[PDB]
Each structure stands twice: as C-alpha cells, then as structure tokens.
Design a protein around this nucleic acid. Structure first.
Lengths: 86, 112, 136, 50, 44, 175
RNA sequence: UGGAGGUAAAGCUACUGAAUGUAUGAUGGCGCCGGCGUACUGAAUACAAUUAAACUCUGAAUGCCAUUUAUUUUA
RNA sequence: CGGUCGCCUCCUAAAAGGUAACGGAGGCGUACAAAGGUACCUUCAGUACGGUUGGAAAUCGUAUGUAGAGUGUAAUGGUGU
RNA sequence: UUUGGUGCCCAUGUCGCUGUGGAAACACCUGGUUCCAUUUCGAACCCAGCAGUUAAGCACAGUGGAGCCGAAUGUAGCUGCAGUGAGAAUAGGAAAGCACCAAGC
C-alpha cells in the first residue's frame, strides 16, 4: 500500500566534459589545433609542441603528428609533430 | 647521500632537460665541464645529436686561469656561421672559471 | 555465519557467473573434493550446514578444507512496498560459484567415510555436485 | 558568499585600473603595488580605492 | 657576532701539564685540578 | 696540535697495524655534530633561548637552530617552531672538541667508569651522550636549569666498526 | 597499415580493502610466579592458494579517428 | 507527505566520445602578498641500529627501503631532480 | 681498442658479491688569502695547486645470489564449429647497446 518510502540522499552527478583523443597520427595539422585533452598529464609534450595551463597539448609548427612510447616500464606516451617533408 | 660527482652529472642533466624542453627556436649549445685539474668546452649542434668541435687544456695548453679556450672555439663557430649560441653551465655555477669563459666567448663576437 | 567484518562499499552490483570457472579448478589440500557442475549463488548458511554435516560424519580423525568464502552482499527490499526510492537493504552474504570448481575437500579418513561425508554435504548445495579425486 | 574583490588605481593618473582578491582578516596591512597603466604609458604605483 | 676564542693554553696544576688546541680566551691559560692524565682511574 | 699528531703518527701507526696499501682506507673522522633536545618551546619558558645560550658558550662557532619535521600531535607540534639545536663543524674545531671532550669534561665525571655499550651501529659510527648539563670549562654557572646535555657523534670514513674503534682508541678516547 | 584507450578475461607476496590451511609465532586474553604454560585469539614474515563497478604488476577482439590502393555516389 | 531542483570527482558507461533512473559513493558557493613569477640550492614517508632528558613516538648520525611522503580540500589523473 | 666527457635509450642497461688499474686524464687529496660559499661549516658550491692515493668513485673480468625479460604447446576470453588470441607459470636469456669530441696506442 501507500508508504512514504524515500531517503534517496544522493542523485548528484556532474556534467561530463569531453576529453581524450581528438586527433591521430597521419593528418596534417595547422598550428593552434588542439590534439589531446586530459585531466592530468598522460601524454608528455615532445618536440615542436606546447602545453597550456589546462595542461592542454597543442601544436606550434606544421607537419604530420606521431606518437612515441617510452618510460620506466614503457608505459608513457609522447606526442610530436614533424615538418611536412619528403 | 651523493659523491660530489654524481651530483654534478645530475645537475647537468636537469639543465640539459630544461634546455631541450624550453627551446622553440634552434640555437647551438656550448657545454662546459669543469674538472679537478682543468676545464673543457664542447660545441654541440642540436636536432642531430652530434658534436662539431671541442677544446680544453688537453690540447697542449696551460691548466687553470685559462680564458684562451674561451676564444678559439668561439672562432671555430664563427667560421662555421654560428653566432646564436646558448651558454650551458654544465654541472656548475655561472661564476669563476665559468664566468671567465663566458666573458671570453662574449668579447669575441658571439651572441648569448 | 561466515561473514566479512568491513567493506569499502555497502551495496555492490551483481556478478555474472557464466562460462568456465576461474581459480580453484583443482584440489589443493584435501584428498577428495566436491566439484560443482553449475554456477549459482550460495549463502553462508548452506556452507555452515555442509560443514557441520561433514564434521559430524567425520569425527576427530580427518581434516576438511573450504575453498570459497562470501565476498559479496546483495540487497532485498522489504516486503509490500512500491518500486523506486533507491536501493533496499542487505540481509545476506553470498559467494558466487562458477561451474567446474571445487567447494569442499576432505582428507585423512577411509574411503567410504569420506565418500558418504561428501555426498551428505552435497545435497545441501543448490548446485549439481560431483565427487573428485586428487590429481596426481 | 563573502565579499573579496578590491579595486586598485594609481595616484598620478587617478583611474580605477585593476581588480583583485584580497582577504582583510589575513592582510591587515593595506596592499600596495606597482603596475603598468593604459593612460600614461608607464608603470606607476597603485593603491586600493574603497 | 660570536665569542671569538683563539689559541689559549690549558694547564693542569695537579698534574703540572700544559696542552693547547683551543680554549677560552677571556682568562688566558685556565687552571684545572683534575684531568685525564692526572686521574689514576682514567688510565686504569 | 693533535691534528698533526694524528696525521703523522697515529695514521701511519694504524696503517702499519692494519697493514694495507692505501693511507685513506685508514679510518678518518668525517664530521663533528652537536645536537640539543629542547622541549620548553611548547611550555613557553624562554623559547629555545637556553639551548642557544648553552651552545654559544660551548662552541667557538655561531650556533643555529633546527625545526621539527613531523606533525607531532602529542603536546602540540607541527612543521616549524624551532625545537632542538644543531651544529655541524669541520677542520681544526674537530680536534679542538675532541681534545676538550677527552681532557676536560669526561675525566671530571663524578661517577666515571668509561663509556662503552657496543654503541656501534655496525656502519662505523659511535654516539656519546654527555649527561650532566654544565660540565665544560667554557660554559659558566648560573645560566639555566632546564635539564639537557650533549649528544656527540664520532663518525668514520668507512663502515667497519672495528676500524673506527681502533682509530678512537689510538686517539685517546676513554672506553 | 599506423595510433589512442584500460573495460571482456585473467592475477591478488604488484599495491588496495576480505579471507582459507600449514610452518614462525609478535601482540594479547586466560591461568600462573619483569617472568611462565598457553586444547586459545592472533599483527609481520616464507609456502599453497581466493574475490571485485569503484584494486590493477599486466592485459584482447570488436568498434572509433585518418591516411593508402581500387570502385561508386554528387552527396 | 517524504527527498531533490546549480556546479565538480569516480563507477554504473560494454578500451573514441557521449548516454539515463527518486542509482551507487562524496564534495563546492573558497583560499594564497605568497602556496603566484623568476633565478638558484635541495629531495620520498616509514623502519632499524646507536645516544641525556626522550616512554610507541620529540632530536641527531648512519643505513635501508622504489612512493604506503607531500601536492591549500571531494575524487580522479598526474607528478621519484 | 683502451680511455675520460656528454647526448637519445631508460632494468635483458637493476641491487649487489669477488679480484684487477690508473701514463695521459677523471677523481680522492693539499688549504681557505684572492672571486664565491653554508639558515652553520671550505660537509656541498668556489677558488689555487698537485705531496700522497688503489682505499673509494670509475672501467675492466667473473659471479644468474636477489631483481627484471620471456620462447613453444595447450587453455580463458570473442568475432563469423573456424579464425582469433590472453594472463599465471614453465624450459631459457641477460653483468647493456648505438653515435660524437679529445688524448694516446
């Protein structure tokens, strides 16, 4: 029958803001195009790339983008961009 | 916990990491190493991880002071069309022999 | 009965137990074990019943080993209430059972005694049990 | 729900030029700085105006 | 700055001995009645 | 000057006793440390002034304080509020403090029976605790009544405790 | 073909909270004169082995981002 | 009636991203004249040994140990020159 | 080759254990007056010199002791009775490798 069964006490949840992989290797990237969003630092800035105060990775010079693997147990990723060359 | 020698290598490494992460325009580097007896200088070009030339007191010159080493290697770089160099402190402080070398490099037409 | 004392969470989700078993696929300590040929959910009260039956039919001569333990806590919303209003309340602790893994094991007692003990303990479980010997 | 903003301007050119957070209960001494100005094209001293 | 003591002697009048590395300067050559050399149980 | 005495005779004496082929494998004193334990900073007696005063009157060297490095919720202690005092010294002061300890203070102990409990930690270090408050000549009476003493440490260049013991025994250390 | 990921599964001396047997038993409690036997509870250690949405030393396939060859639409 | 109405962290969310329920769990409506900027110097916590106050635990030296230390906070990620 | 210096690689490059060697050098070392220096002190930084040094750092040779990587087969999972391929662990491996400058063979 009817009964005041309530007491949820929690339904709160924050709006999810998209992040992660926004670009990939093999595409020409003009300067200023954001490549990877993250909360933290899981992709170290390599060469010819810049880091913004949100730790946001972006490019400075044109060229093809590539990822490299390194680290103490080979589990760290670097993003880099090379000039368009043959 | 260190040995006065690993510390020098460690601080040279922190400085090298700083120079490699900071650069957005390409300038050759002039590394300097001070030892117990004398000093040495090495002109390195980046983007290739190779070395143009070097100088020291081991080239049959007097030990330290010795500011002449701070000129000839400079003349080495200007003859290879390099005037935009960055001065590394190696694993030492910008003072004494290092400062003497820096002023020697400065006074013969180098820009840093 | 056999219950954990604290947990970082109070009401976790359920778990599927389809597919072949994981871990405890072979005997370890006892000489003769009881394997389960069906995955299901068993509470600690049935485990207690099986253990007391094993002990009573065993005597202070052999030894027995229990291979699993309830690590999960489901909920059961009280009776005659409407749907919603969050999750209910926990009232039992259950151990997931995957098919093809052993439940109880015994050793150090003649063959007829251990066989009858395992058969007596088997009917107390809601799974299709099967006897098994040590792999040697 | 606590007021923390404070406005700073110069004394040589007299315009409210900057805004900043400042706690009264932690800095009883009145803050003063030296900053650039957009009307005299130079760096001048700045104090808060209430 | 700080108490600037310098080279001052160190005598034992019961052992009649003099030594010096560093001592108090305000009273030159302080006298002491018992020391390690003077003490017979110190040596054994 | 005990420094020359050690550098010329005792060093070669121990090199010939422990017959080796290198002079610096022979043990050498590494550092001299003075450590003050202070507890009246939280009780608000003189705010560490007693330790600074005592260390000033004992040392021919400018004293400097040390701070707590832990969150100590026992009385009230966290990250600062200088407690204890610390001095590390080099050079002629090492031999000066050595000769002072071995000629003026320790032989003046009312109940002296030597100082040895195998206090070696096995990595070549010994620690000696001067118990009484005022026992040195450079420190004069009527200063403070807060109970505290001295904690000196003899440390050698190697990790072999036997060599350190031999060095200390050959340098006139009461044992 | 290149690349990102962190789930399916698998593992729990690779941390995180749960625990099973044995070998050591700390620390206890009981009894007993700092100390003692402990039909006993037992942290930490070595050995055999457990479970997970909020544990991960590790870790698929599929899908997704774009480039390559070829076909096709004019979307 | 009871609970909630905005924003943030993880899972639910099925390795792009995103996804709901009066789902599971927690926080926020600030703080910093320095914890911002820069130059320079320096590196875990704990544990053990040894010494006067000093006991589990103050402090000091050494050694060890591969983050159980810290990061103005809820959580996550990141961070061992 | 050795030998110091340093760059990317960061454990199959680690932690150690035992012997071997220092000409040129790197380091220990000799001292704090000159520049510089400690919350303090030539401990570290820095000066100016080379009496001694194989001890240590350092490099060789060994050491599979610890730590690390991990073969083949089989198997768990999934994509349409066949492809797909894990993890743990096993036999094994490993005492780094690739360039550059300078001295001297």
């Amino acid at each position: 029958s009817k009964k005041g069964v309530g007491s949820t006490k929690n339904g709160r949840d924050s709006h999810a803001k998209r992040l992660g992989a926004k670009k990939a290797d093999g595409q020409m990237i003009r300067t200023g195009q954001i490549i990877y969003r993250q909360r933290g630092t899981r992709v170290y800035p390599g060469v010819n790339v810049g880091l913004g105060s949100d730790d946001t990775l972006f490019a400075l010079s044109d060229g093809l983008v590539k990822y490299q693997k390194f680290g103490p147990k080979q589990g760290k990723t670097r993003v880099s961009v090379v000039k368009h060359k043959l | 916990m260190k040995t006065r020698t690993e510390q020098r290598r460690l601080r040279h490494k922190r400085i090298v990491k700083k120079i490699r992460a900071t650069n957005h325009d390409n300038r050759v580097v002039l590394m300097v190493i001070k030892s117990l007896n004398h000093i040495s200088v090495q002109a390195w070009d980046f983007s290739q991880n190779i070395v143009l030339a070097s100088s020291s007191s081991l080239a049959l010159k007097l030990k330290n002071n010795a500011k002449l080493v701070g000129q000839d290697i400079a003349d080495k770089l200007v003859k290879l069309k390099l005037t935009n160099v960055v001065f590394d402190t190696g694993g030492s402080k910008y003072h004494g022999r290092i400062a003497a070398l820096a002023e020697a490099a400065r006074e013969r037409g180098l820009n840093f | 009965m056999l219950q954990p004392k604290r947990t970082k969470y109070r009401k976790p989700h359920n778990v599927s137990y389809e597919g072949k078993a994981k871990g405890n696929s072979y005997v370890a300590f006892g000489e003769y074990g009881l394997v389960a040929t069906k995955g299901n959910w068993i509470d600690a009260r049935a485990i207690e019943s099986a253990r007391i039956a094993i002990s009573k039919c065993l005597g202070k001569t052999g030894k027995m080993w229990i291979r699993i333990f309830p690590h999960m806590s489901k909920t059961k919303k009280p009776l005659e209430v409407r749907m919603g209003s969050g999750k209910g309340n926990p009232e039992f602790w259950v151990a997931v059972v995957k098919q093809g893994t052993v439940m109880f094991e015994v050793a150090n007692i003649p063959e007829s005694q251990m066989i009858k003990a395992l058969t007596r303990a088997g009917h107390k479980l809601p799974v299709t049990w099967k006897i098994l010997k040590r792999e040697e | 729900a606590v007021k923390r903003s404070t406005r700073l301007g110069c004394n040589d050119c007299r315009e409210i030029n900057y805004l900043t957070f400042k706690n009264v209960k932690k800095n009883p001494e009145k803050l003063a700085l030296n900053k650039f100005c957009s009307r005299c094209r130079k760096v001048v001293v700045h104090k808060e105006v209430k | 700055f700080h108490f600037p003591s310098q080279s001052v002697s160190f005598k034992c009048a019961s052992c009649s001995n003099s030594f010096t590395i560093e001592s108090t300067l305000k009273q030159k050559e302080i006298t002491i009645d018992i020391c390690g050399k003077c003490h017979p149980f110190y040596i054994g | 000057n005990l420094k020359a005495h050690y550098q010329k005779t005792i060093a070669k004496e121990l090199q010939k006793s422990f017959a080796f082929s290198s002079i610096m494998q022979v043990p050498r004193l590494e550092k001299i440390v003075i450590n003050m334990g202070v507890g009246d900073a939280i009780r608000d007696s003189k705010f560490l002034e007693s330790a600074l005063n005592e260390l000033h009157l004992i040392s021919g060297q400018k004293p400097v304080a040390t701070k707590a490095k832990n969150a100590i919720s026992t009385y009230k202690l966290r990250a600062g509020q200088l407690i204890g005092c610390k001095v590390t010294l080099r050079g002629e002061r090492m031999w000066a403090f050595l000769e002072k300890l071995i000629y003026v203070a320790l032989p003046r102990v009312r109940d002296f029976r030597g100082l040895s409990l195998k206090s070696f930690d096995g990595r070549g270090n010994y620690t000696i605790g001067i118990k009484e408050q005022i026992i040195f000549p450079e420190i004069v009476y009527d200063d403070i009544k807060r109970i505290r003493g001295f904690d000196v440490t003899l440390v050698t260049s190697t990790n072999k405790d036997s060599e350190a013991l031999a060095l200390l025994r050959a340098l006139n250390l009461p044992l």
